[PDB]
Write a protein that binds this ligand. Structure first.
Ligand SMILES: Cc1cccc(Cn2c(N)c(N(C)S(=O)(=O)c3ccccc3)c(=O)[nH]c2=O)c1
Ligand SMILES: Cc1cccc(Cn2c(N)c(N(C)S(=O)(=O)c3ccccc3)c(=O)[nH]c2=O)c1
Ligand SMILES: Cc1cccc(Cn2c(N)c(N(C)S(=O)(=O)c3ccccc3)c(=O)[nH]c2=O)c1
Ligand SMILES: Cc1cccc(Cn2c(N)c(N(C)S(=O)(=O)c3ccccc3)c(=O)[nH]c2=O)c1
Ligand SMILES: [Cl-]
Ligand SMILES: [Cl-]
Ligand SMILES: [Cl-]
Ligand SMILES: [Cl-]
Lengths: 296, 292, 292, 296
């Protein structure tokens, strides 16, 4: 072999019957947060990290619906592929479903219902994606760490334990649903035995890296918003939050067409074509405005 | 008898990209699809036989969701509006469904709430001649059909989206009609904006002295879910009432049960596949709790 | 005649640091001070003679804000509750105000809304014997006085904040009483938590067969503004109704005018100093607009 | 004179009758945003900038009310002074009212109803406060620039004009209500003639610095939230925003006691004393938790 890449995965799985009847009509990650499908937010997040080749994993039934929404990604300078997940057998199954997609490359895994926002988010992601070996996760202070993977730190700020959804959390630092992995993750994932609750657990993957001294735990500061979108109440809260920001600024959070344009993955002519069919609504008008307005 | 029509019309691209993923009237208002609210409204008026009109793309998605409605004691049919060429087109598309019966039409993105709403609908539906609409005081009457009243409270004009509204009373998206409505709709010409106007149907009744315009009081909430902002506001409004009360607004399973269109055993069957979430848990509680 | 009491009790430090700057019941719910809502409620029941009870610190601030109420056709008096030692203490503090008349008590942080609320209050106030309270289905009945009904709908028990509630029906913070209430309150002993309980007053009437418990339907909104979260929710709820309708909820100037306690010239005087904002503009519009 | 400071000003003036009747009961900057008086947010902002000596300017009637809330500041390691503003004669009057307070020192002026939030806000402020000469302002992209002072940039990103509330804005970049000044501002302020609308205008002060080549215009990025709190609707929106963040994180935005503690202006014993009278509510419980929890 001769030399002359980091690939993305969005787990947009079946949310069961938890949000029914809202979700009888459509899968969770197709429901909007304010003005855009939920999946726009994690997609935009991977895009901000510089990732163009992205696998979307969803149920057999939802796959064609995501495909209708997003296509192959080529209109936005992306290469979107799709894989079906028959059964909800944990998040780490992503690496077995996505094995041939990842191949010998670096990877990033993001949850389809996580929403992130803040200043220099691009730089926070960039430094995780820059580490070409080991694994990188983000820790975020929350009120309810028991709902998440929880990280414990020693007095010098070094991570010393990870626990999946502990009933007695060692700290208030939750591991966010955005993970950066090197080439070892698939082989780590293949050795996972399902948990007491019958799932292949992402926390076990992360603990394998930690045990090898190869896990970076970066703090995602309190000046960032990490919002969850998996209850009716939290989905509503997330929409209000985005609406308040966007209406204040006259700028959008997680507009994929914008992010592709600013990454130079598409050019001004291409953005104009995307603006055309959306011209009679605010979204297409927004895209048109980006062709002439300097936004810092 | 009175049959129901839900016009779940196409919103073009106004709600894109949200509506590139899911049909407009399948978008949730808080915890249930938008269409449950007008469905529940017709159900509260005692209407079991309902035509859902939508776009060629969305109509099959409503049908996949709701089926024939037998599970809720309903008789649901479907029809397609090829192009959004006016709300009054509902009566032409719905002509064979309506037949020789009385009808009611509700817009798919209209949400209603308040005390004795059941009685307000009952009074309209019991008039078996003429037409009955509701007037509601709004801040932005220019977005709607506007009804003008004289000093005695009699309705004297109707204007669709007037640049100079004659009052702040908007006609809500809920309309009751006798056997004349199909033939009135057949003899409409399109307006200046290429639409068969529901306001034109309503004016035809007004001109014959057969339009009843009842006030929907300020104690009722009439909300519009046609924009991202209004949809969001409607969600918060419902969430606040539901979380306060531990009761739902516009749960079709509940309304069917209270109308005795379905019995406790059927309500229990419906609760089963939703039993892992709060909605089935709510359906189950309805079997054992007295709610006045 | 029936006189009114607003108990604007001390919330201790529960709302600090917000309540280090301003009295709890002067905090705004959207666009007006909290106290306007219960004031408007009493006013809607036809009650013009109102005692405002509050803390030694807050009472003078209500008095500085509202004066004697003559500008709104009211007769307002003030009294102090030295320590928050139970809601029933209102009747002891208010004994000389009440005199030999009928009374009504409303909690200062309770907000009500809905269709024919005027009629619901009127029916309670017209009973000149016994007591009348309202039961409302809630999600968290353990935070309130809970009324238990038998199979015929008759109220059979009342419990204050039960660990095992017998129903989901909470007694709302609105109470109507005959001439017996002062002497019932005088013969109460403090509860296990050192409070003269309003639920104990209500049980004394229940034991004599003179408590009316009417259902406040699910079509009414009864909201609590006692926490930062509930206050915020109440604000959004009011804002949504007001911005939809272009009408206000619980504007005392409006209710006085509609009750004919003040006339158009007085309403016009009140609008003048607020004419630069939407509230005076609203008061001014009320002079020329028919609102049903 | 022998050698061996930047002072703060909060303009918490009379908001007229615009928010009545809510404000008949209390002045605008005493109204809460979610769980704390509005003034807590600009106060915390100056504190984050490292500023301890702060003048609060308000009406004769409101002065004692702010004084009851805040005292002299010494409980939080601050030196709070108060000056009365009889008449609402524009924002720049602050420098004439505050002349003897500023003396020969550097200054910062902040509006009592501006709310800011985001990652590395401390660093954004630090770099403005570090410039010991000239003036520093922040530009923020908004939907409605016509409500504010607006800054225009040339193609190289250099500020070339400032306009107060233009009916035809040159850009969407509003000047935020947070201003850093050197020793020249009082003398600049004394030469201001009132505007067409009878006010001493902050934009005229800023343009004087710009004309001297001494104005830095830093971009406040879209990852920061700058919210306005001066309508009933926006106050409500601001409260929802703070509530969503705080309830998500179990951390507070603009808790002054926290900021003083983290600045080391008060110590753990002093924070414990402040926690005591607030112990039965969430706020005092929060303060107690900060004595034992490491928050990054
Ligand atoms: C490619 C790129 C790099 C750096 C900045 C931007 C501008 N940007 C930003 N900052 C944001 N954010 C508000 S963000 O970094 O917090 C973000 C980005 C993607 C998804 C969620 C939030 C955005 O949504 N869209 C943008 O075009 C784009
Ligand atoms: C069949 C029936 C008749 C009268 C009352 C009720 C109870 N009810 C009510 N009142 C309501 N409302 C809160 S409602 O009348 O304002 C309503 C009803 C259907 C759709 C939207 C609001 C409801 O949503 N579901 C109910 O089962 C049901
Ligand atoms: C005196 C009067 C009697 C009947 C109706 C009205 C009109 N009205 C109504 N209905 C209301 N409501 C929306 S209400 O009855 O639900 C109400 C009234 C007072 C306090 C809270 C809600 C109102 O706030 N102000 C009014 O002037 C006024
Ligand atoms: C003194 C200090 C320096 C750096 C960070 C902090 C932590 N912090 C932060 N970041 C915040 N923010 C969320 S902030 O920088 O966006 C801020 C700070 C003050 C007022 C508004 C927002 C806060 O409110 N309280 C804090 O104690 C404190
Ligand atoms: Cl941060
Ligand atoms: Cl009404
Ligand atoms: Cl009801
Ligand atoms: Cl930014």
């Amino acid at each position: 072999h001769h030399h002359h890449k980091r690939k993305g995965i969005i787990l947009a799985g079946g949310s069961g019957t938890r949000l029914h009847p809202a979700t009888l009509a459509i899968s969770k990650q197709l429901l909007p947060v304010y003005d855009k499908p939920m999946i726009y937010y994690p997609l935009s997040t991977l895009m901000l990290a510089g990732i163009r080749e992205i696998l979307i994993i969803s149920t057999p039934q939802d796959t064609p619906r995501f495909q209708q929404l997003l296509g192959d990604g080529s209109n936005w300078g992306l290469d979107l592929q799709y894989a079906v997940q028959p059964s909800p057998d944990g998040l780490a199954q992503a690496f077995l479903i996505g094995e041939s997609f990842i191949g010998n490359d670096l990877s990033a895994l993001v949850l389809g219902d996580n929403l992130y926002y803040g200043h220099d988010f691009h730089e926070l992601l960039g430094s995780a994606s820059q580490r070409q070996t080991g694994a990188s996760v983000f820790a975020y202070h929350v009120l309810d760490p028991e709902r998440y993977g929880v990280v414990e730190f020693d007095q010098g700020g070094k991570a010393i334990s990870l626990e999946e959804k502990p009933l007695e959390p060692k700290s208030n630092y939750a591991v966010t649903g955005l993970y950066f992995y090197d080439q070892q993750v698939v082989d780590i994932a293949r050795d996972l035995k399902p948990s007491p609750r019958g799932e292949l657990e992402i926390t076990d993957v992360n603990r394998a890296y930690l045990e090898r001294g190869q896990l970076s735990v970066e703090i995602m500061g309190r000046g960032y918003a990490w919002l969850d979108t998996g209850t009716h109440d939290s989905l509503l809260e997330a929409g209000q939050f985005i609406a308040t920001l966007e209406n204040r600024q006259g700028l959008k959070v997680a507009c994929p067409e914008e992010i592709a344009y600013r990454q130079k993955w598409i050019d001004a002519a291409q953005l104009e074509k995307l603006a055309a069919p959306l011209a009679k609504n605010g979204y297409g008008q927004y895209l048109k405005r980006l062709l002439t307005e300097t936004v810092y």
